[PDB]
Amino acid sequence: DYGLPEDFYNKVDLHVHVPDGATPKDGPSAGITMATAIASALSRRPARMDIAMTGEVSLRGKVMPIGGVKEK
Amino acid sequence: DYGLPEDFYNKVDLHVHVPDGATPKDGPSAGITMATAIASALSRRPARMDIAMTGEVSLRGKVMPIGGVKEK
Structure with a gap:
């Protein structure tokens, strides 16, 4: 769907x-960051600037809430 | 019998x-949970909403009794 190999x-x-990554947050709280990072690297598409992200990821792919959105 | 790819x-x-993580106690109290989750994922059918369950499974497809059903 995004140019990645099968x-x-x-x-x-x-x-x-x-x-x-040894953040005070118990979880990573940077899941979708790694998701788009991996997608960009493996698909060879440039990840945009000026768009800073945060949010957890599930195996099915649902972005759960995160703790402390004020700090983020 | 439950609609999976052959x-x-x-x-x-x-x-x-x-x-x-896992439960630090002996005995995974979500055996049938894993069974129905794997079935739903492979069924390509949307599972329902908020149907709680617990227990274990056997090799023949039976539910084993589990202790501490109280706190659950």
Whole structure:
């Protein structure tokens, strides 16, 4: 649907750096960030600027709430 | 009997999330939960809404009794 290959968890490795993930938040609270990061990297599409994101991800793909949207 | 593709254990990969890690007690109290979840995912049919359950499963497809049904 977005240019990704049909199978890329069997033929493409991944390294995922994170600057500071030992956040006070119990969860990551940066799920969709990694979702779009992986999609951009594997599809070779540039992730836009000036759009800072946050939100959890489920395996089905529903963006749950996050704690402390004021800080975000 | 429950509408699944005839090849689901040979050509369809699967992932399962259970929140708060596992239960540090002995005995996964959501066996039939996993059964019905896997069935619903592979059925390509929308599951219903807020039908709570608990227990375990057997190799032949039976529900085992579980202790501590009280606090649940």
